[PDB]
Amino acid sequence: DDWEIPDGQITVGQRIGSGSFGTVYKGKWHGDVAVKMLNVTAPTPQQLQAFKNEVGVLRKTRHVNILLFMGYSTKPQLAIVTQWCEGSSLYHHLHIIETKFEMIKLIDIARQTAQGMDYLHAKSIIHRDLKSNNIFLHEDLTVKIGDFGLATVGSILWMAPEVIRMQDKNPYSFQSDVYAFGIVLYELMTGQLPYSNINNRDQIIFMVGRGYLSPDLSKVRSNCPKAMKRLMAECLKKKRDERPLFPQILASIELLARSLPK
Ligand SMILES: O=C(Nc1ccncn1)c1oc2cnccc2c1Nc1ccc2c(O)cccc2c1
Numbered sequence: 001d002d003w004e005i006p007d008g009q010i011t012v013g014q015r016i017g018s019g020s021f022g023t024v025y026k027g028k029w030h031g032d033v034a035v036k037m038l039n040v041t042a043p044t045p046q047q048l049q050a051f052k053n054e055v056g057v058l059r060k061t062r063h064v065n066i067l068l069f070m071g072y073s074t075k076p077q078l079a080i081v082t083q084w085c086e087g088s089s090l091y092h093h094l095h096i097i098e099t100k101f102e103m104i105k106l107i108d109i110a111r112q113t114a115q116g117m118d119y120l121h122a123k124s125i126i127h128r129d130l131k132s133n134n135i136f137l138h139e140d141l142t143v144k145i146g147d148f149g150l151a152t153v154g155s156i157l158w159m160a161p162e163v164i165r166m167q168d169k170n171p172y173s174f175q176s177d178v179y180a181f182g183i184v185l186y187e188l189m190t191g192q193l194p195y196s197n198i199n200n201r202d203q204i205i206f207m208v209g210r211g212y213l214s215p216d217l218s219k220v221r222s223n224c225p226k227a228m229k230r231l232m233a234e235c236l237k238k239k240r241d242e243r244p245l246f247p248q249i250l251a252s253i254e255l256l257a258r259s260l261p262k
Pocket of ligand 1: 016017018034035036082084088092136147148149
């Protein structure tokens, strides 16, 4: 029943990039796998706590739209093993290689992402870093949400105003996740990262924090449904209490999807 993996079984290949508290590699373990390592060297209790946190969260998830946790290793290096998705993150698709998806496909990506988040929230899991970088598109038609290093039970463009202005102990909530999801709806419907006409990261943090800046929803392509534009504004609300929860969001996306291909 346990998920630990003995030293030697995992074969590490290509270094493909970074993830919360470490480095992502392509690996071999009963097939292609993603492996994230939280060392170099003897680990800090800082690392240890980050490791045990994520593993604990992942072993609680079993759902199509969530990156399948497969196992973990401590023996050589603190490592987390999940399934492999060829064809990159929504971020890479959108802002690097510039894949121009169709609206039917874009809406589907939103519905599937909403689907995974509803699951997470129904399980009382708050991702706390939902962004296009962590939305991986497996075999070009199935959305898997990954990276749970920050989750519980600086990528600022997705941060809610409350989260920006670090007030009280806990700014993170279902609603802050909803907000981050709002920005992915933006990325999907505009094809752009928000605030792209401002070349000052700090002015962006200050401004959104004080509520002077909000995503310009006039940039959504003309074939994007009005109901989607309407839902986006609801997720991007400056007051966290005025946001809908994912059950409600999911029902919204399903509805517009049904009466669309006509
Ligand atoms: O990083 C990637 N792709 C990139 C990264 C940067 N630039 C381009 N492509 C990347 O490419 C992948 C392919 N398949 C699965 C996962 C990833 C993945 N990322 C992650 C993120 C978090 C992980 C975690 O928290 C635990 C275990 C595995 C993890 C894998």
